[PDB]
Amino acid sequence: MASTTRLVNDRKQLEQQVKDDARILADARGLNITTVANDSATGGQAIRNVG
Amino acid sequence: AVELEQLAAYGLTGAYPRTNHSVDTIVKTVNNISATYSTIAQMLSTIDLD
Known part of the structure; x- marks a missing residue:
């Protein structure tokens, strides 16, 4: 006990503390958003009604 | 109509019906039957019914 x-x-x-001050000073460089499309079909x- | 020996053999061996087809095929066939009846009914009603 000492x-x-x-x-x-x-x-x-x-x-x-090191994790924090390694990020306070790091530069902020934003990226460009890409790969945006309608690909969620x-x-x-089908139902194919009979009659 | 079945004969006694065939039924006895079926019972002794404990056989049961078995198939590997899916449900949708049978209901598709039933729908086809209903459609072919309805087509004839429509033709009769639009041509002959009097």
């Missing part, structure tokens, strides 16, 4: 028993939590906090068997 300062050596606080290393794992220290690493957790350090990891979270639905199949099945």
